[PDB]
Each structure stands twice: as structure tokens, then as C-alpha cells.
Amino acid sequence: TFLTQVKESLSSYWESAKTAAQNLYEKTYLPAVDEKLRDLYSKSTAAMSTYTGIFTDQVLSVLKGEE
Numbered sequence: 001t002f003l004t005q006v007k008e009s010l011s012s013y014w015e016s017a018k019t020a021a022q023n024l025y026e027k028t029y030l031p032a033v034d035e036k037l038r039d040l041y042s043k044s045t046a047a048m049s050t051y052t053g054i055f056t057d058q059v060l061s062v063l064k065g066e067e
Helices: 003-027 051-063
Strands: none
Touching: none
16 A cells, blocks of 8 residues: 555554543543453454444434435
């Protein structure tokens, strides 16, 4: 790749900020899951892995009909 690389690059720079900000939030603080538990579901077939991106897609595109 190349184009997509630049994206994940600039985003990665801030990704960590979103990571440490997520963990302290409710990603690991007290989610009551954490991979070991957040994998059986989001791995059956990307139930929550790729759906996290399809969740909102079915909100704006269903609430405003635009996505």
C-alpha cells in the first residue's frame, strides 16, 4: 500500500493518545471484559471488531439517510 499507509501513520501518532485515553476511560479500567472476554464475540466473525465501524454507518445512514 501507500495512500492508506499515510493515514494510519498520521492517525497512529494520535492513536496512542486515544488508546491511553480509552483505557483509563472504560477500555480496561472496569469494562468487565478485556480481550479475553472481548474476543469470543468480536472474533466469531468480527461481531464487534469490524462492526465498530458498521455500527455508526447504520446510524447516520438510517437517522439522516446519509451515513
